[PDB]
Design a protein around this ligand. Structure first.
Ligand SMILES: CC(C)CCC[C@@H](C)[C@H]1CC[C@H]2[C@@H]3[C@H](O)C=C4C[C@@H](O)CC[C@]4(C)[C@H]3CC[C@]12C
Ligand SMILES: O=c1cc(-c2cn(Cc3ccccc3)c3ccccc23)oc2cc(O)cc(O)c12
Ligand SMILES: *[C@@H]1O[C@H](CO)[C@@H](O[C@@H]2O[C@H](CO)[C@@H](O)[C@H](O)[C@H]2NC(C)=O)[C@H](O)[C@H]1NC(C)=O
Ligand SMILES: [Ca+2]
Ligand SMILES: [Zn+2]
Ligand SMILES: [Zn+2]
Length: 779
């Protein structure tokens, strides 16, 4: 509420309160207000950002952007090359890499500071496509810890990903579900430009800077008004690092608009990309040079991280909704590399998403987007449980845009696509005493980083979507020790408790260690279920849901596929181990015109004709739409054998998922919205499978003594195959493409089932946590 105090040295100061008296911050330009004689004493430019010999020993001239005077080291406002030019020191990039075993911090530093150097639109492959031009970045990468790439969250846009980095949450949970959003409860829109985004109401979860503050760790200001030149951002961090140790922050963030901006103008692989990459490396070098002359280069942990990649996208490759819909003026479209559609609602509830989606489904052979109800999007995207996400979503093909009409090249790159697309992958490098030395780590998802940044600062993370401990292998020391959750429900192991004569199911037939390689899955909620053993498979059968929670079986490389004898096609047999009242019945299915059934262990993989009869037990049967059985039957008859054949055997765990409220979490019985007609048999929203083998494929899956290899999926249990535009073709032409789109992490299935897998292995639990967060992308 005041525009004219004199920020007594408060330039870029980390201590503020409300109004009046203007604030002294690098965000003042964004609020169009600081003690604006806190301004141009603070934003100088004179004489550039590098000392020259003739400047060495100058008397401090307050007009210079940085200083080469004898009092500058005190304040940290020397040019970062000051000691190299004036004191005979070398550039940090010219020094050999020396392992940092303990933090070497100067007087007054209680903990190693963390600096996050974030770069917008830094595609992972840039780490090579311009490698000879990034000496500082490549040193950090080769001498610290790096992954080949880090996976962003969907949508692969800046604000959803920066806030995921900050909170460890999926966008649906932290609230920043796009760069642009409409919230029906606020009845307001959020935009990259403008002031609406500054209202705290938009931002959920608990970001790193608030986590630190709440726990007594001071945070620098992570955000920079775009007018502040990148060199000044570095010099300000360095000046803050020079504050006394009761004002000095322990965690800092630098941000650069590059290489995103040049990626947009020229595309990710234009020759024009080299200059921005050179400039970014120069800035990294200024930072490392600045840390060295403050004797902090072996004390600070540095993270170099991007928010997303960049793809080739041109105005020529635009789909227009007006080519599909006759009434595009009754709808609002969030356009581009993704689509979100809602009604314009001034005179319109003829708006029905069901018709719009049907009108956007496989209408042109080479159609470059696919419509979805948000709950039918691949579950790995975790993009549905937020009122800011429109019911209608368009997943846009990489390299394409979607727009409303041809009225909506200047740009050649864009991003925002499906986060498993390789062009969207970005970078992670960690460098410092707490990160490992010269260590490469597998790719990981950016939702994991908040836990690590917390660990790096001694903070307890707020609850988030990372898996705490899955990244412990990045860290030399003070990791957090994860422990496996305790099993909640104990199984029963029923024997023969009833005889075939007590069953009134309406079912007929023509019937008159090996399979649990990683230990029994633990059930982490309260329920009643039975362990059922068979020659070919083992299952945990829920007496609540009348169907297995999981079915586990091992299929050797040499396994033979057999068909279902004609006399057995309709066969369903009572299971004398399970009460008829906790059993499904076959009349429910004959009475449900829309529902058929399938089996979790496939009769096609039975080991003998004797054992095949086991596969037809009522305890192995699950409700399946006929459309979905086309998918499931192909998977069980064809794909499982294929996977066994390619991977030297596989262990498979399959089962149902119920997520009618699309929150990514296992439904309670109350939340289940669909049952087989006139029955208590719930209808799954999805069916999962987890396919495990030995990473050393020279060992059979049942004889593995090292790291495991997993691929998993969560297939939508849908009554049609409209998602698959080629489903009228033979299944060999579309089912595997469907499954690859719905690939999943084991962790995703854990949340959706309440089960805990891999509880009995020869691996460390941290190593297992890495396995559970793996995603097989097929990219
Ligand atoms: C003008 C643009 C270049 C920069 C825009 C910066 C803006 C997105 C940032 C700056 C101030 C931030 C909020 C502030 O840190 C307080 C918190 C508390 C935390 O609990 C939730 C997030 C929130 C609201 C920050 C969100 C992002 C803000 C608005
Ligand atoms: O000043 C700006 C700062 C930022 C970001 C800062 N960090 C650092 C960080 C470190 C740990 C956890 C969360 C965040 C980012 C990371 C990823 C993406 C963006 C940023 O993004 C901007 C985007 C704009 O469009 C305009 C801006 O001025 C900024
Ligand atoms: C992602 O993480 C958030 C935060 O832990 C989870 O949301 C929490 O969900 C529980 C269970 O519904 C609620 O009681 C809390 O209100 C939510 N937030 C917090 C801070 O506890 C969310 O379920 C996670 N998503 C997935 C898919 O696991
Ligand atoms: Ca649910
Ligand atoms: Zn970005
Ligand atoms: Zn961008």
């Amino acid at each position: 509420t005041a525009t004219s105090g004199s920020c007594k040295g408060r330039c870029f100061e980390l201590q503020e309160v409300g109004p009046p008296d203007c604030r002294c911050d690098n965000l003042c330009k964004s609020y169009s207000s600081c003690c604006h004689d806190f301004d141009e004493l603070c934003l100088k430019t004179a004489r550039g950002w590098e000392c020259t010999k003739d400047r060495c020993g100058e008397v401090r001239n307050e007009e210079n952007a940085c200083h080469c005077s004898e009092d500058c080291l005190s304040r940290g406002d020397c040019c970062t090359n000051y000691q190299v030019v004036c004191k005979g020191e070398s550039h940090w990039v010219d020094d050999d890499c020396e392992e940092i075993k303990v933090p070497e911090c100067p007087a007054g530093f209680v903990r190693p500071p963390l600096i996050i150097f974030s770069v917008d639109g830094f595609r992972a492959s840039y780490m090579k496509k311009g490698s000879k031009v990034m000496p500082n970045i490549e040193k950090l990468r080769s001498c610290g810890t790096h992954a080949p790439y880090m996976r962003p969250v969907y949508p692969t846009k800046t604000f959803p990903n920066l806030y995921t980095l900050a909170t460890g949450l999926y966008p649906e949970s932290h609230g920043i579900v796009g760069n642009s959003m409409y919230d029906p409860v606020f009845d307001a829109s959020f935009h990259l430009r403008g002031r609406e985004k500054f209202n705290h109401r938009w931002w959920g979860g608990q970001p790193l800077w608030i986590t630190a503050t709440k726990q007594g760790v001071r945070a620098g200001t992570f955000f920079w008004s775009v007018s502040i030149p990148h060199e000044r951002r570095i010099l300000t961090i360095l000046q803050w690092l020079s504050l006394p140790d009761n004002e000095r922050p322990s965690v800092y963030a630098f941000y650069s608009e590059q290489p995103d901006f040049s990626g947009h103008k020229y595309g990710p692989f234009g020759p024009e990309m080299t200059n921005p990459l050179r400039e970014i490396d120069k800035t990294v070098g200024q930072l490392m040079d600045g840390l060295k002359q403050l004797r902090l280069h072996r004390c600070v942990n540095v993270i170099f991280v991007g928010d997303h990649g960049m793809e080739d996208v041109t105005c020529d490759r635009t789909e227009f909704l007006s080519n599909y819909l006759t009434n595009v003026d009754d709808i609002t479209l969030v356009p581009g590399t993704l689509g979100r559609i809602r009604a314009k609602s001034i005179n319109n509830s003829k708006y029905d998403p069901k018709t719009i989606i049907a009108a956007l489904t496989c209408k042109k052979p080479d159609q470059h987007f696919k419509p979805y109800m948000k709950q039918h999007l691949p579950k790995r995207l975790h993009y549905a449980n937020n009122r800011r996400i429109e019911d209608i979503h368009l997943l846009v093909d990489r390299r394409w845009h979607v727009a409303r009409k041809p009225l909506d090249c200047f740009f050649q790159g864009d991003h925002g696509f499906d986060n498993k697309v390789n062009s969207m992958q970005t970078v992670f490098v960690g460098y410092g005493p707490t990160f490992k030395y010269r260590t490469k780590v597998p790719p990981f998802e950016n939702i994991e980083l908040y836990n690590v940044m917390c660990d790096l600062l001694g903070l307890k993370p707020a609850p988030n979507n990372g898996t705490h401990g899955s990244l412990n292998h990045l860290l030399r020391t003070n990791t957090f020790r994860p422990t496996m959750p305790d099993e909640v429900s104990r199984p029963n192991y029923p024997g023969i408790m009833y005889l075939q004569s007590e069953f009134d199911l309406g079912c007929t037939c023509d019937d008159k260690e090996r399979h649990l390689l990683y230990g029994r899955p633990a059930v982490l909620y309260r329920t009643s279920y039975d362990i059922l053993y068979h020659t070919d498979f083992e299952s945990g059968y829920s007496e609540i849901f009348l169907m297995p929670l999981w079915t586990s079986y091992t299929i050797s490389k040499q396994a033979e596929v057999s068909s279902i004898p004609e006399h057995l096609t309709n066969c369903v047999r009572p299971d004398v181990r399970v009460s008829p009242g906790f059993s499904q019945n076959c009349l429910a299915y004959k009475n449900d015109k829309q529902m058929s059934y399938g089996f979790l262990f496939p009769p096609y993989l039975s080991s003998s004709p004797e054992a095949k009869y086991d596969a037809f037990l009522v305890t192995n049967m699950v409700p399946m739409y006929p459309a979905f059985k086309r998918v499931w039957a192909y998977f069980q008859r064809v794909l499982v054998k294929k996977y066994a054949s390619e991977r030297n055997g596989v262990n498979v765990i399959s089962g149902p998922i119920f997520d009618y409220n699309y929150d990514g979490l296992r439904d309670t019985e109350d939340e289940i919205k669909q049952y087989v007609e006139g029955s208590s048999i719930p209808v799954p929203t999805h069916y999962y499978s987890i396919i495990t083998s030995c990473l050393d494929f020279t060992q059979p899956a049942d004889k593995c003594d090292g790291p495991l290899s997993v691929s998993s999926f969560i297939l939508p249990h849908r009554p049609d195959n409209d998602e698959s535009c080629n489903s009228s073709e033979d299944e060999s032409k579309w089912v595997e493409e469907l499954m690859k789109m719905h690939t999943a992490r084991v962790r995703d299935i854990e949340h959706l089932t309440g089960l805990d897998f891999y509880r009995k292995t020869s691996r460390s639990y941290s190593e297992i946590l890495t396995l559970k967060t793996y995603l097989h992308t097929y990219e």
